[model samples]
Target: MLYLTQRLEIPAAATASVTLPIDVRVKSRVKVTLNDGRDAGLLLPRGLLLRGGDVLSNEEGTEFVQVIAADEEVSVVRCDDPFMLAKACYALGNRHVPLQIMPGELRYHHDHVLDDMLRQFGLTVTFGQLPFEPEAGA
Candidate 1:
C-alpha cells in the first residue's frame, strides 16, 4: 500500500485523486483505493478530517493525492420560512443528525425517520444525491 502521511498546504499539481464520502474522510487512518485503483492508506493525525480539495502527499512528496467529496444520499428540505427551517434544524440537531444548512435549504444524510419528522413540521422534504459537509462543531 502507498501510505500518504502528510497534508500539504500549497501543493503543486496532484499526482492522483481519491473520491470519498464523508464517513471515510473523517477517519484518520484507513486503507483506500485511488481513483485509478491503486492501493493507498491514510496515516494522518488523529481527529483530522479530510475535506474535498485537501491535498495529501507521500513522505517523499513525489505522490500527491487530492480529495473529492463523493455524492451520497441525503434528504433535502427547502423552505422560505426561516422559522420553519430553524425549527427543523433544532429538531435535527436534538436528534444528533449531521446537517448542512443553506440559505433556504437544509440537508442531512438521508434517513426515513428524519425525513418523516421534517415532513411533520410542514416542511417539504426531497431526496438528493449530493456531498454533505455538515456543521463542524463536535
Candidate 2:
C-alpha cells in the first residue's frame, strides 16, 4: 500500500494521478481506496479539505498523486452579482452548509430542501457535474 503523508506544492500535477473523494479528505489519517483499485494511506491534516487538482505526497516528498475531486452529481447555484452571492453564501454558511465556492459558482451535495431555499432566494439550482471542494476546515 502506498503511504501519502502530506500535501505538495508542485509546478504541475502528475499526468497519472489518483481521484480522492470527500469521504477520505475529511479525516486526519485514513487509508484510501482509489478508483483505479489501488489503496494508499492518506496521512493528511485533519480538517484539511482537498481541492480538485491538489497534489499530495509522502513524507519524503518524492512520491505524489494528483487529487481529482470525485466526479459526483452536485447542485450548482451561480450568480453574477457579488452582493447576492455574498448574501447567499452567508445564509448558507450561517446554517453551516459546506459550500464549494468556485469562480462564479457555488456547489453542494444535492439537498432538495436546500435547493428550494436557494430558489426562494432568487437563485436557480441546476444539477450538473461538479466536484465538491468546500473550504478547508469548514
Candidate 3:
C-alpha cells in the first residue's frame, strides 16, 4: 500500500485524477480510493482544505494525483439581468441552500422542489451537469 502524506505540484497531464464530492473534498484526513482502484490515505496539513483542481502526490512525488470536483445533476438558473440574478441568489440564500454563482448563472445541487419555486419567481430553470463548489463555511 502506498501512502500519500504530502501534496505536490504536478501537471494535470501527469497525474491520475480523483473525483470526490464536497463531503469528501473538505476533509483533510481520509482514506481514499483512487480512480485506478488504489487505496491511499490523505494525511495533509491541518486546515489545508481541499478544493477542486488541487494537485497532490505521494511523499516521494513518484505518484501524482489530481483532485477533481465531482459533477452532479444540478439546476442551473441563468439570468441576463443583474437584478434578477441577485434575486435568485437572495432566495437561495434565504433557504440556506449552498449556491455557486458562476458567470451569469446560479447553480445548486439538484432539487426538484426548489426548481418549482424558482420557476414561480419567473426564473428559467434548467437541469444539467454542474460542478458544485459550495462556498467555504457554507
**Against the true structure, whose lDDT is highest?**
1
lDDT of the structure predicted as candidate 2: 0.75
TM-score, candidate number 2: 0.79
- The TM-score leader among the candidates is 1
* Model 1 clashing residue pairs (backbone): none
Worst 10 residues of 2 by lDDT: 9-18
Could you tell me the lDDT of residue 76 within candidate 1? 94
Candidate-wise lDDT, in order = 0.90, 0.75, 0.79
Candidate 1, which segments miss by more than 4 Å at Cα? none
Candidate 3: list runs displaced more than 4 Å: 8-13, 46-48
TM-scores for all candidates? Answer: 0.90, 0.79, 0.81
Lowest summed lDDT window (length 10), candidate 1: 129-138
In model 2, residue pairs whose N, Cα or C atoms come closer than 3 Å (at least 3 residues apart or on different chains), thus clashing, are none
Sort the candidates on lDDT, descending order.
1, 3, 2
How well does candidate 2 match the true structure, expressed as C-alpha RMSD?
A: 2.6
Better of 2 and 3 by lDDT: 3
Angstrom error of the Cα, residue 25, model 2: value is 1.4
Q: State the lDDT of candidate 2 residue by residue for 15-130, as single tens digits.
A: 34777668766666887765567787887766576777777886765666788887777888888876777777898898898888876889887888888988888887889876
